[PDB]
Structure 1
């Protein structure tokens, strides 16, 4: 799965559809990249998987209000 590790964006069910009367499945897949961040509480760099719409959130909110509260129990990152 192409998961945006910084937001939980996953693939979704959906149809292609065009100007045609016959309708066929698509299932929307994300574009998937990596990005590296600094954690001032652990004084180390970490690498996370990122995607469109999701990578737009973290840069806007700030890592000290996103990545600094992202662990649900630890997730070994």
Structure 2
């Protein structure tokens, strides 16, 4: 599924609206990517299906923390 393994971001439904405001169902879905991440603390690469932001989080909090989560939460990975 199109779920960001870091943020839990998933597709959400909203509307389209024309210039005449005609509503047509639609979905916003996240900017997923799947990415080889180096951990070093395990001498290995791990591919997380990750959103940008998911990346920007990993940048900030730093991988291992994020990996504490997921494992804390049960995410396969």
Task: Name the TM tier (shorter chain).
Answer: 0.7 to 0.9
CA distance in 2: counterparts of 1:69 and 1:21, whole angstroms: 42
Per-residue deviation, 1:14: 0.6
Aligned to 1:7: 7
Q: What is the RMSD of the two structures over their aligned residues, measured on CA atoms? A: 2.2
Kindly indicate whether the alpha-carbon contact (under 8 Å) linking 2:34 and 2:47 is maintained by their aligned counterparts in 1. Answer: yes
TM-score by length of 2: 0.73
CA distance in 2, matches of 1:39, 1:74: 18
Q: How many residues get paired? A: 77
Q: Which stretch has the larger CA shift, 29-38 or 1-10?
A: 29-38
Rounded Cα–Cα distance in structure 2 between residues aligned with 1:51 and 1:75: 16
Q: Where do residues 29-40 of structure 1 align in structure 2 (5 Å cutoff)?
A: 29-40=29-40
Query: Structure 2: where are the runs of 5+ without partners?
Result: none
1:73 deviates by 5.3
Return 5-14 or 28-37, whichever deviates more: 28-37
